[PDB]
Amino acid sequence: REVMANLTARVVGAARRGTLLEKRETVKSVALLVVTPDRGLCGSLVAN
């Protein structure tokens, strides 16, 4: 995490901020990661 902190501090140029550093404008498509229990009987966690 502090490695990311330092690297983000150094890299400020938007052009050289490529890959996962591109805060792309005009957001169109977004991906989401959902993690759930394998089996039931977990209570209300899966519902939440």
């Binding site: 938007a14 052009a15 050289r16």
Partner: protein, 71 residues
């Protein structure tokens, strides 16, 4: 015995030596930079052309001084 001939030759040669070795490193650096990232683009082109014109001026001196001896 023809001293002006060697004078003109030396002037032209030692004026023209510089800009080649300059421009080499010049555009090498800029092209490496643009290969790293094409964003700068024209901005680097502009940074390059004036720098090259600076050595073109010395080339002009080298040619002109020989021309004065040549005529």
């Amino acid at each position: 015995e023809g001293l002006n001939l060697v004078a003109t030759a030396l002037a032209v040669g030692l004026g023209a030596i510089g800009p080649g070795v300059g421009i080499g490193i010049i555009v090498s650096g800029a092209v490496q930079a643009i290969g790293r990232n094409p964003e700068i683009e024209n901005r680097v082109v502009t940074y390059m052309f004036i720098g090259i014109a600076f050595t073109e001026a010395l080339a002009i001196f080298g040619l002109v001084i020989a021309f004065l001896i040549g005529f």
